[PDB]
Design a protein around this ligand. Structure first.
Ligand code: CHL
Ligand code: CLA
Ligand code: CLA
Ligand code: CLA
Ligand code: CLA
Ligand code: CLA
Ligand code: CLA
Ligand code: CLA
Ligand SMILES: CC(/C=C/C=C(C)/C=C/[C@@]12O[C@]1(C)C[C@@H](O)CC2(C)C)=C\C=C\C=C(C)\C=C\C=C(C)\C=C\[C@@]12O[C@]1(C)C[C@@H](O)CC2(C)C
Ligand SMILES: CC1=C(/C=C/C(C)=C/C=C/C(C)=C/C=C/C=C(C)/C=C/C=C(C)/C=C/C2=C(C)CCCC2(C)C)C(C)(C)CCC1
Ligand SMILES: CCCCCCCS[C@@H]1O[C@H](CO)[C@@H](O)[C@H](O)[C@H]1O
Lengths: 196, 95, 151, 39, 195
C-alpha cells in the first residue's frame, strides 16, 4: 500500500500489519510498543466511530422517508428518558470501567484475561490482541487479513465521517443527511464556501 | 456549680494513679531509651559541672521507684486537666 | 457578580469611557476634510473603537469601578477564555517549539561537528522536524512512559 | 551558490527571516482579529 | 487469587496471609515491619467498623433515631442523653467523656504492651472463650472470614459518611428507602453529574 506514490514507507511499517499503507509522516509509531498501543487505539476509536456514525446517520435517513419519527443526534439527550442522564451516566461509567479495565489488562498481558471470573468453566480461545473472538464471534466468521483490513478501512472512513458530522453540524446547524440533501439540491451553490 | 477541691483532687488523683500504675513501665522504658549528650559523651562528662543528674533527689523507697519528680509531673498534668475542666464549665459558651 | 464586579454590558463607566474616547476622536476629526486620508483614518479608529467595546461587552467581560475589563482566572467556567483556553493554546505552541528544538539538538548530537549545525542551521532537517511538533503531546507522553525523555 | 545557501542558513539570517515571518503573521492576525483580550 | 486479574502481585505478598489478595499499588507494605503493623491496624479498624456499622443501622430502624442526630444532644447546656428511649442519669458530656477516656486509654495502652506480633492482632486466651482458635486450619479460615467481613464493614462506613456528606441529617437506612422509592431517579447521579 502506498498512501503517497511514491514515498518510501517507514522502516517500522513492513506491511506485517493490516492497513499498512506506509502512512506515518510524523513518526509516531517509530517505537514498537507505541505501534502496538496505536494499533489498539485505531481499532477501538475506529469501531466506536463506526457504531456512532451509523447511529447518527441511519436514524435520520429513516426519519426523512417517514418510517419512524426519530429526533436528531445532537438533540436526542434533552430530557426524554425514564432514568435520567445522570443515572445513565453512573451506570455507563461503571460498566465501562469494568469492561475497559478488562480489555486494558488484555493489552498489557494477552493471555492474562480470557476466562469468566464468576463461571470459570467458560473461556475465550487464545487469539490476537484487539481481536478477541470466541463468544464475541458467535457466527464464527474467519478473522482473515482481508476482513481485518476491511474493518480498519471502514473504521478510518467512519472516523473521518464523524469529524465531518461534528464540524458540519457546528457550521450549518442541521443534520448530516440534511446537509447531503441540500448539497444534492444545488451542488455548485451549497458547499462549505457558502455556509461559512 | 462544681466544687474546685473535689475536681482538682479527683483529677490529680486520676493522673497520679495513671502514672503510678498504667503508664509507669512505658515512661520508664522511653526514658531508658533517651539521654541528652554532646559529641558522644553526656553534658556532665563534657563536662558542665551544673549538668550532673541528681541521684539523691531521685531516690525513693517506693516499690516501683515512683519518686518526687514523677509526683510533680503527673501532678502537674492533673492540675492542668482540673483547671481546664473548671474554667471550661465556668464559661457560658454555646455553639 | 464575581468579586463584586459588574458586567461590562451593564457597566455605566465602561459606556462613559467609550463615549469620551469617541468624542475625543471626533474632536480631533473636526479639523480635516471628510474625504481626506486623515479623516478616513480617524473614522477608522472610531469604528474600530466602538467595535472593540461592543465585542468586549458581548464576550461577557466583568468590569471594575474603573470601567475596565477585569479577568477571572480561578477556573470559573464562565470565563475559560479569560485564561484557560488561551493558556491551553499557548502551552500547545510552546510545547511544539521546545519539542522541535529538542528533536533538532538530538538529531545532530551524533555527528562530526555538532556545533556547526548549531551556528549554521540544517534547514532540510529543520523542515523535516518542523511538523513533528503537531503531535508533541502524544510524542512526549509516549517518551515519558518509555524512558526516552530523561537520563 | 551552495555557499550562499549555507550563508542564508546561518543563525542571524535564519533568525531575521523566521522572526520576520512571525512578525508578519502576528501583524496580519492582529489586523483581521483586532483588540483580542479573550481567546 | 488476586484483586486485579492479570496484574502481577508484589514480591512480598505471596497470599499466605488472611485476606492477602495482592493489593498494594502504593507499595506501602514494602517494609516488613510496617507491613506487620499494617496487618494489626487493619484488623483494629476492621473490628471497630464491624461494631460500628450495625450500631448505626439498628437504632435507626428500631429506636427510630439517627447516627447523626444522636450526636446533637451534646454541644448544648442541656446535655441529656437517651438509651432505648430511657434518659440515662449519668448521660452528660463531661462525665461520659472522662469515663470513655480512662477506659479506652487503659485498654488501648494495655494492648500496646504486648510484644508478640501474632497476639498483637490475634490475642486469644481470655478473648476466646469458645476456643474457636484451638484448631489451626479453622483458625486460618475464620481469620480470612474476619478480615473480609471487616473490610466490607469499613467500606460500609465510608458509604455512611459520604452519604451523610451528600444528604445531611438523613441516615443510611433512610437513603436506602429513598433509593427504593425511585431507583432510577434517586441515585448518586444528583451528586456526581448534578445538577
Ligand atoms: C461521543 C460522545 C458524546 C458527544 C460528541 C455528545 C454530544 C452532545 N451531547 Mg451528549 N454527547 C456525548 C456523550 C453523552 N451524552 C450524554 C447525555 C446527554 C444529555 C442529557 C445532553 C447531551 C447533549 C449533547 C450536546 C451538547 C453539546 C456539548 O458538548 O455539551 C456540553 C457538555 C459539556 C461542556 C461537558 C452534544 C450534541 C445535550 C443536548 O443534546 O442538547 C440539545 C444534552 O442535554 N448529552 C450521555 C449520557 C450521560 C453520554 C455518554 O457518553
Ligand atoms: C489516509 C491518509 C492519506 C492522505 C493525507 C493522502 C493524501 C494524498 N494522496 Mg493518498 N492514498 C491514501 C491515503 C492518503 N492520501 C491511501 C490509503 C491510498 C491507497 C493506497 C492512497 C493512494 C494514492 C494515489 C494513487 C495518489 C494519492 C495522492 C494523494 C495526494 C493528492 C493531493 C490532492 O490534492 O488530490 C485531490 C494527497 C497528498 C496522489 C498524489 O498526488 O501522489 C503523489 C496520487 O496520485 N494517494
Ligand atoms: C453505538 C452507539 C450508539 C449510542 C450511544 C446510541 C444511543 C441512542 N440511540 Mg441509537 N442507534 C445506533 C447506535 C447508538 N445509539 C445504531 C448503530 C443504530 C442503527 C442500528 C441506532 C438506531 C436507533 C434508533 C431507531 C433509535 C435509537 C435511539 C437512541 C437513543 C435511545 C436508545 C436507548 O437508550 O435505548 C436503551 C438501550 C437498551 C435498552 C439496550 C440513544 C441516544 C432512539 C432515539 O431516541 O433516537 C434519538 C431510537 O428510536 N438508535
Ligand atoms: C488557588 C488554587 C486553585 C487551583 C489550583 C484551582 C484549579 C482549578 N479550578 Mg478553581 N477556584 C479557586 C482556586 C483554585 N482553583 C478559588 C479560590 C475559587 C473561588 C471559590 C475557584 C473557583 C472555581 C470554579 C467555579 C471552577 C474552578 C475550576 C478549577 C479547575 C479548572 C478546570 C479543570 O481543571 O478541568 C477539569 C477538572 C478536573 C479534571 C478536576 C477539577 C475539580 C476537582 C474536584 C479538583 C482547576 C482544577 C473549575 C472546575 O473545577 O471544573 C470542574 C470550575 O468550574 N475554580
Ligand atoms: C509574512 C507574513 C505574512 C502573511 C501570512 C500575510 C498574509 C496576508 N496578507 Mg500580507 N503583508 C505582509 C506579510 C504577510 N501577509 C508584509 C511583510 C507586507 C508588506 C509588503 C504585507 C502587505 C499586504 C497588503 C497590502 C495586503 C496583504 C494581504 C494579506 C492577506 C491576503 C489574503 C493575507 C492574510 C491583503 C489583505 O487581505 O488586506 C486586508 C492585502 O491587501 N498583505
Ligand atoms: C508578556 C505577557 C503578555 C501577554 C499575555 C500579552 C497578550 C496580548 N497582547 Mg500584549 N504586549 C506585551 C506582552 C503581553 N501581551 C508586551 C511586552 C508589549 C510591548 C511590546 C505588548 C504590546 C501589545 C500591543 C500594542 C497589543 C498587544 C495585544 C495583546 C493581545 C493580543 C491578542 C492576539 O494576539 O490575538 C490572538 C493571537 C493568536 C491566536 C496567535 C496564535 C496564532 C497561531 C498561528 C495559532 C496556531 C494554532 C494551531 C493579547 C491579550 C493587542 C491587544 O489587542 O491587547 C488587548 C495589542 O494591540 N500587546
Ligand atoms: C485503614 C486501615 C487499613 C490498613 C492499616 C490496611 C492494611 C493492609 N491492607 Mg487493606 N483494606 C482496607 C483498609 C486497610 N488496610 C479497606 C478499607 C479495604 C477495602 C477496600 C482493604 C482491602 C484490602 C485488600 C483486598 C488487601 C488489603 C491488603 C492490606 C495489607 C497490604 C497493603 C498495605 O500494605 O497498605 C497499608 C495500608 C495503609 C498504610 C492505609 C493508609 C491509607 C492512606 C494513608 C489514606 C487512604 C485514603 C483512602 C483511600 C480514602 C478512602 C476512600 C474510599 C472511597 C475508599 C496491609 C496489611 C492486602 C493484604 O495482603 O491483606 C492481608 C490485600 O490483598 N486491603
Ligand atoms: C461499638 C461502637 C458503638 C458506639 C461508640 C455506640 C454508641 C452509642 N450507641 Mg450504639 N450500638 C452498637 C455499637 C456502638 N454504639 C452496636 C454494636 C449495637 C447493636 C447491639 C448498638 C445498638 C444501639 C441501640 C438500640 C441504641 C444505641 C445507642 C448508642 C448511644 C448511647 C449508648 C448508651 O448510652 O448506652 C449505655 C451503655 C450501656 C448501658 C452498656 C454498658 C456496657 C451511643 C452514641 C442509643 C442511641 O443511639 O440513642 C439515640 C440507642 O438507643 N446503640
Ligand atoms: C470514536 C469516534 C466517534 C464516536 C462517536 C460516537 C460514539 C457517537 C455517539 C453518538 O452519536 C450517537 C451514536 C447517538 C447520539 O444520540 C449520541 C452521540 C453520543 C452523539 C470518532 C473518532 C475519530 C477519530 C479521528 C477522526 C482521528 C483522526 C486522526 C488522524 C486523521 C490522524 C492522522 C495521523 O496520525 C496518523 C494516522 C499518522 C501521523 O504520522 C500523521 C497524522 C496525520 C498525524
Ligand atoms: C504517701 C503515700 C500515699 C499517698 C500519696 C499521695 C496521695 C500523694 C499525693 C501527691 C499529690 C497530691 C501531689 C500533687 C501535686 C500537684 C502538682 C505537682 C501541681 C502542679 C500544678 C500546676 C502545674 C499548676 C499549673 C497552673 C497554674 C499555676 C495556673 C493555673 C493553671 C495551671 C493549672 C496551668 C499512698 C497512700 C498512695 C501510698 C504510699 C504512701
Ligand atoms: C524550505 C526549505 C528550502 C531548502 C533550504 C535551502 C538551503 S538548505 C542549506 O544548504 C546548505 C548547503 O548549500 C547547508 O550548508 C545548510 O545547512 C542548509 O540549510
Amino acid at each position: 500500500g502506498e498512501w503517497l506514490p511514491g514515498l518510501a514507507s517507514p522502516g517500522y511499517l513492513t506491511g506485517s500489519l493490516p492497513g499498512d499503507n506506509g502512512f506515518d509522516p510524523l513518526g509516531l509509531a517509530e517505537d514498537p510498543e507505541n505501534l502496538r498501543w496505536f494499533v489498539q487505539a485505531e481499532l477501538v476509536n475506529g469501531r466506536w466511530a463506526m457504531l456512532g456514525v451509523a447511529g447518527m446517520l441511519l436514524p435520520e435517513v429513516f426519519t426523512s422517508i417517514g418510517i419512524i419519527n426519530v429526533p436528531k443526534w445532537y438533540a436526542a439527550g434533552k430530557e426524554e428518558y425514564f432514568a435520567s442522564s445522570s443515572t445513565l451516566f453512573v451506570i455507563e461509567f461503571i460498566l465501562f470501567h469494568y469492561v475497559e479495565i478488562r480489555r486494558w489488562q488484555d493489552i498489557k498481558n494477552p493471555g492474562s484475561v480470557n476466562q469468566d471470573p464468576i463461571f470459570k468453566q467458560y473461556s475465550l480461545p487464545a487469539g490476537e490482541v484487539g481481536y478477541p473472538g470466541g463468544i464475541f464471534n458467535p457466527l464464527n466468521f474467519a478473522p482473515t487479513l482481508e476482513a481485518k483490513e476491511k474493518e480498519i478501512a471502514n473504521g478510518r472512513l467512519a472516523m473521518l465521517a464523524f469529524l465531518g458530522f461534528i464540524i458540519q453540524h457546528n457550521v450549518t446547524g442541521k443534520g448530516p443527511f440534511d446537509n447531503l440533501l441540500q448539497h444534492i439540491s444545488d451542488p455548485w451553490h451549497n458547499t462549505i464556501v457558502q455556509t461559512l | 456549680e462544681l466544687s474546685p477541691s473535689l475536681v482538682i483532687s479527683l483529677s490529680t488523683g486520676l493522673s497520679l494513679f495513671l502514672g503510678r500504675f498504667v503508664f509507669f513501665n512505658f515512661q520508664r522504658e522511653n526514658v531508658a531509651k533517651q539521654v541528652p549528650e554532646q559529641n558522644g559523651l553526656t553534658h556532665f562528662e563534657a563536662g558542665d559541672t551544673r549538668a550532673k543528674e541528681y541521684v539523691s533527689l531521685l531516690k525513693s523507697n517506693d516499690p516501683v521507684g515512683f519518686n518526687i519528680v514523677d509526683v510533680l509531673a503527673w501532678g502537674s498534668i492533673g492540675h492542668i486537666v482540673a483547671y481546664y475542666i473548671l474554667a471550661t464549665t465556668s464559661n457560658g459558651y454555646d455553639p | 457578580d464575581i468579586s463584586g464586579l459588574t458586567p461590562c454590558k451593564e457597566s455605566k463607566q465602561f459606556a462613559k469611557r467609550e463615549k469620551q474616547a469617541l468624542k475625543k476622536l471626533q474632536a480631533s476629526l473636526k479639523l480635516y476634510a471628510d474625504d481626506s486620508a486623515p479623516a478616513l483614518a480617524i473614522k477608522a479608529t472610531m469604528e474600530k473603537t466602538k467595535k472593540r467595546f461592543d465585542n468586549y461587552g458581548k464576550y461577557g467581560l466583568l468590569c471594575g469601578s474603573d470601567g475596565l475589563p477585569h479577568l477571572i482566572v480561578s477556573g470559573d467556567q464562565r470565563h475559560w477564555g479569560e485564561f484557560i483556553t488561551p493558556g491551553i493554546l499557548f502551552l500547545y505552541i510552546a510545547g511544539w517549539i521546545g519539542w522541535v528544538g529538542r528533536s533538532y539538538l538530538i538529531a545532530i548530537r551524533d555527528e562530526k561537528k555538532p556545533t556547526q549545525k548549531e551556528i549554521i542551521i540544517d534547514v532540510p532537517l529543520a523542515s523535516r522536524l518542523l511538523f513533528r511538533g503537531f503531535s508533541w503531546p502524544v510524542a512526549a507522553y509516549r517518551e515519558l512512559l518509555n524512558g526516552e525523555l530523561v537520563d | 551558490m551552495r555557499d550562499l545557501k549555507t550563508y542564508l542558513s546561518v543563525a542571524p539570517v535564519v533568525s531575521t527571516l523566521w522572526f520576520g515571518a512571525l512578525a508578519g503573521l502576528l501583524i496580519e492576525i492582529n489586523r483581521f482579529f483586532p483588540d483580542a483580550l479573550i481567546f | 487469587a488476586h484483586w486485579m486479574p492479570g496484574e502481577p502481585r508484589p514480591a512480598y505478598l505471596d497470599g499466605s496471609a488472611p485476606g492477602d489478595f495482592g493489593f498494594d499499588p502504593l507499595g506501602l507494605g514494602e517494609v516488613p515491619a510496617n507491613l506487620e503493623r499494617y496487618k494489626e491496624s487493619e484488623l483494629i479498624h476492621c473490628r471497630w467498623a464491624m461494631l460500628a456499622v450495625p450500631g448505626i443501622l439498628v437504632p435507626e430502624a428500631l429506636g427510630y433515631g439517627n447516627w447523626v442526630k444522636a450526636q446533637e444532644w451534646a454541644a448544648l447546656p442541656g446535655g441529656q442523653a437517651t438509651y432505648l428511649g430511657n434518659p440515662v442519669p449519668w448521660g452528660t458530656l463531661p462525665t461520659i467523656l472522662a469515663i470513655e477516656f480512662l477506659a479506652i486509654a487503659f485498654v488501648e495502652h494495655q494492648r500496646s504492651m504486648e510484644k508478640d506480633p501474632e497476639k498483637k492482632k490475634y490475642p486469644g486466651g481470655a478473648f476466646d472463650p469458645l476456643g474457636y482458635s484451638k484448631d489451626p486450619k479453622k483458625l486460618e479460615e475464620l481469620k480470612v472470614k474476619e478480615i473480609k467481613n471487616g473490610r466490607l464493614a469499613l467500606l460500609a462506613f465510608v458509604g455512611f459518611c459520604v452519604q451523610q456528606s451528600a444528604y445531611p441529617g438523613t441516615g443510611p437506612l433512610e437513603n436506602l428507602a429513598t433509593h427504593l422509592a425511585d431507583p432510577w431517579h434517586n441515585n448518586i447521579g444528583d451528586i456526581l453529574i448534578g445538577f
